[PDB]
Amino acid sequence: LVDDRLAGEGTGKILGINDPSLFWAITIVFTIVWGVFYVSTREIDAASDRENDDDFGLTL
Amino acid sequence: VWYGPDRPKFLGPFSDGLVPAYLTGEFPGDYGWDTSGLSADPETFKKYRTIEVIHARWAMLGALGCIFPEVLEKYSGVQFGEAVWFKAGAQIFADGGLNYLGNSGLVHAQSIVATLVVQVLLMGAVEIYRANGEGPNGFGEGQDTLYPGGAFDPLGLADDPDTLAELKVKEIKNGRLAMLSMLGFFVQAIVTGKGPLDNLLQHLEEPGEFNFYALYANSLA
Amino acid sequence: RSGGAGYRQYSGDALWLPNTERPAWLDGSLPGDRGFDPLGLSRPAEYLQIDLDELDQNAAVNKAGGVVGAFTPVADQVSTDSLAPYSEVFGLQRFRECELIHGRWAMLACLGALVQEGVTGDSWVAAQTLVYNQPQYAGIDLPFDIYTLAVLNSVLMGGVELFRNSELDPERRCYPGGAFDPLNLASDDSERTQKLREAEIKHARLAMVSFLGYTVQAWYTGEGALGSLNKFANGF
Amino acid sequence: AATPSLNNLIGSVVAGGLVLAAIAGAITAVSNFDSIR
Amino acid sequence: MLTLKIFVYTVVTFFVSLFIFGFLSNDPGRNPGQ
Amino acid sequence: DTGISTPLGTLLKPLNSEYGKVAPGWGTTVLMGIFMALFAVFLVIILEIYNSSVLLDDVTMSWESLA
Amino acid sequence: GLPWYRVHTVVLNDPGRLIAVHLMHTSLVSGWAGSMAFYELAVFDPSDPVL
Ligand code: CHL
Numbered sequence A: 001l002v003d004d005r006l007a008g009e010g011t012g013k014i015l016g017i018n019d020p021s022l023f024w025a026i027t028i029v030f031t032i033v034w035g036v037f038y039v040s041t042r043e044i045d046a047a048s049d050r051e052n053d054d055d056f057g058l059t060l
Numbered sequence B: 001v002w003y004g005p006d007r008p009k010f011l012g013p014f015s016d017g018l019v020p021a022y023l024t025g026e027f028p029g030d031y032g033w034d035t036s037g038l039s040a041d042p043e044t045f046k047k048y049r050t051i052e053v054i055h056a057r058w059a060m061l062g063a064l065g066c067i068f069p070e071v072l073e074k075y076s077g078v079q080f081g082e083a084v085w086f087k088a089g090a091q092i093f094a095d096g097g098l099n100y101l102g103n104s105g106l107v108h109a110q111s112i113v114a115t116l117v118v119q120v121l122l123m124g125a126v127e128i129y130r131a132n133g134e135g136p137n138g139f140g141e142g143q144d145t146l147y148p149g150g151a152f153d154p155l156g157l158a159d160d161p162d163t164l165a166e167l168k169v170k171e172i173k174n175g176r177l178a179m180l181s182m183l184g185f186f187v188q189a190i191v192t193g194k195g196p197l198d199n200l201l202q203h204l205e206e207p208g209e210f211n212f213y214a215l216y217a218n219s220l221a
Numbered sequence C: 001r002s003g004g005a006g007y008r009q010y011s012g013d014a015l016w017l018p019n020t021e022r023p024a025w026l027d028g029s030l031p032g033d034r035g036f037d038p039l040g041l042s043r044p045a046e047y048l049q050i051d052l053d054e055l056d057q058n059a060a061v062n063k064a065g066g067v068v069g070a071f072t073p074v075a076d077q078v079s080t081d082s083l084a085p086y087s088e089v090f091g092l093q094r095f096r097e098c099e100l101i102h103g104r105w106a107m108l109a110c111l112g113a114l115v116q117e118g119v120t121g122d123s124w125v126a127a128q129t130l131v132y133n134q135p136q137y138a139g140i141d142l143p144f145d146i147y148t149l150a151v152l153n154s155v156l157m158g159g160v161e162l163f164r165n166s167e168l169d170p171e172r173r174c175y176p177g178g179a180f181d182p183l184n185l186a187s188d189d190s191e192r193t194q195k196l197r198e199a200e201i202k203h204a205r206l207a208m209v210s211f212l213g214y215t216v217q218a219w220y221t222g223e224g225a226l227g228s229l230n231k232f233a234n235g236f
Numbered sequence D: 001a002a003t004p005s006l007n008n009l010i011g012s013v014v015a016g017g018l019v020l021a022a023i024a025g026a027i028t029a030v031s032n033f034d035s036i037r
Numbered sequence E: 001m002l003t004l005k006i007f008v009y010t011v012v013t014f015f016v017s018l019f020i021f022g023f024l025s026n027d028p029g030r031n032p033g034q
Numbered sequence F: 001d002t003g004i005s006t007p008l009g010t011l012l013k014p015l016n017s018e019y020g021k022v023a024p025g026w027g028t029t030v031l032m033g034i035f036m037a038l039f040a041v042f043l044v045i046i047l048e049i050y051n052s053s054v055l056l057d058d059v060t061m062s063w064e065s066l067a
Numbered sequence G: 001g002l003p004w005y006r007v008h009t010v011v012l013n014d015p016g017r018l019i020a021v022h023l024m025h026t027s028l029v030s031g032w033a034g035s036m037a038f039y040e041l042a043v044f045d046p047s048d049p050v051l
C-alpha cells in the first residue's frame, strides 16, 4: 500500500470501537459524569420539598 | 431498611424460622444467616465480624488486583511480564525482574527475599497498629478498630452517622461479593488454568459451549 | 573544673564587630541576632501617603495630590491575602522567613551538589543539561520523558509551596513543626529549642554563602564543587 | 586587549564626568555662596 | 487520526452524558408551576 | 458602591492597595542615578561599536561576522 | 460639549474601561496580523526562492 489509515469504515464495529482506547474514553467520561450526578441526587430532589417515595414524580 | 427487625434476610420469604435471636440487625450485612450457630457467643461474634470485614477488604483489593493487570494487557498497550494473577509471582525470577506496568524503569524488583523482608516489616508494623488499636505515638488511639475514620477517611465520606450506617452495608456487600468471586478466581484458576478475564471472554464467545459443564465437568472425577 | 586557663572568658554580647552596638530594631531575641544590619533593611520603615491626583475632566482645575500624612505601618502581620500575606515587605519576621527558606534551600543544594558530583562524576552545572537530554538519577535512566517531569516539577512544587503559604502565624511559618518535627527535637520552648534554632541559621547562612561560592567558581574556573577543589590543589 | 580607540572612549567618559563634576561643583559653590533668605 | 478519534469520542461522550444525566436530575420539577 | 466582587478581584486586590504610599525625601534617587549613568555609558559603547568609532579586535562589525 | 480630539479621554480615570479599550486595540492588532498573513499567503509564490 501507499499510506496508512484506520480502515474501520464500513466494518460494523460495536460503537465504532476499532481499538480499546475508545472504550476507555467513553467509559471513563460516563463514569465521571455519573459520579458527580450520583453524589448530587439527594440535593436535586430535596428542592422538591418532597421525599422520592413511590408517590414522588410529576404526575397528573 | 438494612437495620432492625424488618431488614432483608438471606432466605427471602422463608427466612423467619431460622433467624437467630442474637442476630438482631445492629450490624451491617446482617441477613440473619447463622444456621451453624458459629456466632452464638457474643464475644466470638464480635471477632468474626472483624475477620469478615478484613477478609472482605482484602478480597475487594484482591479481586480488582487479580484482574486489572489482565484487563490492561488485553485491552491496552501495556505489556506485563505476566498479566495472569496466579502467574504474577514468578515474574520476580525473570531476567529483568518484576517491572511495574512492564516498564523497566519502574520498581524493577529482582530479589524475592528483599520484597518479602520489606513486606513483613511494613505489613508487620501496620497489622500491629491495627491489632493494638494505636499506631506509632498513639496515632489511632481512641478510634474504632474496625472503622477508624479520621486519617483513614480523608474525604470525610462518613461524617454523617446515618450515611455511615448505609455505607457500611455497601462495604460489606461489595466485600462479600468480592470474597465469593475470589473463590471463583481460585477454583477457576485450578480447573481452567486461564486468567479470570480469559474465562469471561470464553463464556461470551459461546455461552452454551464454553462453560464449566461443557468443558471441565467430566474431568473432575 | 572551672577553667579560665587556655581561653579568655570575656563577658559581652557576641556581635559582628568586636565593639559595636545592636541596632534598636535588632533586640537579640531572634536566633542568630548578631546586630548585623548596616543598611538598616529591618529598620521599621516610615512612609508618607499622597492624596489621589484630581483627574476629573468635569472640573476646571485638577491639582495633583499632596502629602495627606506620615504613617509607619505595622510590619510582621500576616493576613489571608494569598498573594501578599505580610503587611509590609520590610519586616524583620518576613525577612527571617526569607532567610530560613533561602537558607534551607541552600543547605539541600550544597549537599546535593556535592553528592551527585561524587556519585556521577558530573559537575552540578553540567548536570542540568545532561538530565534535560537524558532524564537519569544515580546512573539509572528514569522512566519519564523530560516534558512530563518539567510539568510535574512545576505542579508538585506549586502544590508544596501553596501548602506552605497557608500558615498565618508568623513564627509557625518559619517553624511549622507538627509533621515536620516528628522527633520533637525543638517543638517546645526550651533552651535546647533556642540553641537548635541558633544552629540552623548558622548552617543556613553558611550554605547560602557556600552555594554562592559554587556558582561564582563555576562561572570563573568552569568547574563544579569537587572539580574546583581538585583544580585548586593542582594549581600549586 | 584594549585598543587605543577603546581607551579614548573610556577617557571620553571620564572627561565627560569631570565636565559634569566641574559644572555641578561650580553651581553648588555659587549657590551656597549666594543663597536666598 | 486515532488521537483525533479518541478526542472526539471523549467530547461526544461528555456532552451526551451531560444530556442524559441532565434530564435524570428531576427535570420535570424544573418548572414555574405550583 | 464597593464595586463588583469577583474571586480573581479579591486575589489581585492586595497588588492595587498602596496607591499613594511613598518613601520620604529622595529615597533611592541617588542609587537610581548611578544605574542611569551606567546605562548611559553602556548605550554610548554599543553606539560607538555600531558607528565604528570604537574598534574592538574580536568584533568585525560587518556582514562577514555571520560566518 | 467634548471636542472630537478628547473623546477617548473618558477612560482616563476608569481603570475597568481602560483595560477594555486597551483590549480592543490588542484585538485589532492581532486581527490585522492574522488578516495580513492570510492575504500574503494568498499572493505569495514559493516556487522560486532564489530569483
Ligand atoms: C497472600 C496470598 C497469596 C496467595 C493466595 C498466593 C498464591 C500464589 N502465589 Mg504467591 N500468593 C500469595 C502471596 C504472595 N506470593 C508471593 C510471592 C510469590 C512467588 C515468588 C510466586 C508466587 C506464586 C503463587 C502461585 C503458586 C501457584 C499455585 O499454587 O497454583 C495453584 C493454586 C492456585 C492457582 C490457587 C491459589 C489459592 C491459594 C492456594 C488458596 C487461597 C488462600 C491462601 C491459603 C491464602 C493464605 C494467606 C496467609 C499465608 C496469610 C499462587 C496462585 C508462584 C507463581 O506465581 O507461580 C507462577 C510464584 O512463583 N507467589 C509473595 C511475596 C513474597 C506474597 C506475599 O504476600
Ligand code: CLA
Residues within 6 Å of the ligand: G004, G005, G006, G007, G008, G009, G012
Ligand atoms: C499609545 C499612543 C497614544 C495614546 C494611548 C494616546 C492617547 C490620547 N491622546 Mg494622543 N498622541 C499620540 C499618541 C497617543 N495618544 C501621538 C504619537 C501624538 C502626536 C501626533 C498624539 C497627539 C495628541 C494630541 C494633540 C491630543 C492627543 C490626545 C489624546 C487623548 C484623547 C485621544 C482622543 O480621544 O482623540 C480622538 C481621535 C479621533 C477621534 C480620531 C483619530 C483620527 C486620527 C487623526 C487618524 C486615524 C488613525 C488611525 C485610525 C489609526 C492609526 C494609528 C496607528 C498607525 C499608530 C488620549 C488619552 C488629546 C488630548 O490630550 O486630550 C486632552 C489631544 O489633544 N494626542
Ligand code: CLA
Residues within 6 Å of the ligand: G025, G026, G027, G029, G030, G032, G033, G034, G037
Ligand atoms: C502567545 C502570544 C503570541 C505569539 C506566540 C505571537 C507570535 C508571533 N507574532 Mg503576534 N501578537 C500577539 C501575540 C502573539 N504573537 C498579540 C496579543 C498581538 C496584539 C498586539 C499580536 C500582534 C502581532 C502583530 C501585529 C504581528 C505579530 C507577528 C507575530 C509573529 C512574528 C513575531 C515577531 O517576530 O515580532 C517581533 C517581536 C518583537 C520585536 C517584540 C519586541 C519587544 C519590545 C522591543 C519590548 C521592549 C521594551 C521592554 C518593555 C523592555 C523592558 C523589559 C526588559 C528590561 C527585560 C510571531 C509568529 C507579526 C507577524 O508575523 O504577522 C503575522 C506581526 O506583524 N503579532
Ligand SMILES: CC1=C[C@H](O)CC(C)(C)[C@H]1/C=C/C(C)=C/C=C/C(C)=C/C=C/C=C(C)/C=C/C=C(C)/C=C/C1=C(C)C[C@H](O)CC1(C)C
Residues within 6 Å of the ligand: B033, B034, B035, B036, B037, B038, B055, B056, B058, B059, B061, B062, B063, B064, B065, B066, B084, B085, B086, B087, B088, B089, B179, B180, B182, B183
Ligand atoms: C455466613 C455463614 C453462617 C453459617 O452459620 C456458617 C457458615 C456457612 C460457615 C457462614 C458462611 C461463611 C462463608 C460463605 C465464608 C466464605 C468465605 C470466603 C470465600 C472468603 C474469601 C476470601 C478471599 C480473599 C480474602 C482473597 C484475597 C486475595 C488477595 C489479597 C489477592 C492477592 C494477589 C493480587 C491482588 C494479585 C497477584 O497477581 C496475585 C495475589 C498476590 C494472590
